[PDB]
């Protein structure tokens, strides 16, 4: 299984999502992140795995 990411339409950062989130709004923003650690556009984009 792979990691899903979604791009914030405001800040253009990619955010990891939980597996199985197969329904998202047309536009998505950091503020909608289920993870409170990554719920603000100012939080840096997490790196990908090596």
């Amino acid at each position: 299984s792979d990691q899903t990411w979604v791009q914030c339409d405001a800040c253009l950062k990619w955010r990891k999502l939980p597996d199985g989130m197969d329904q998202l709004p047309e536009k998505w923003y950091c503020s909608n992140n289920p993870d409170p650690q990554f719920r603000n556009c100012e939080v840096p984009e997490e790196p990908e795995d090596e």
Binding site: S1, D2, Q3, V6, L24, E26, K27, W28, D49
Partner: peptide
């Protein structure tokens, strides 16, 4: 929304 998948070796 715009999404992508990346490899996750731990799984």
């Amino acid at each position: 929304a715009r999404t992508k998948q990346t490899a996750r070796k731990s799984t």
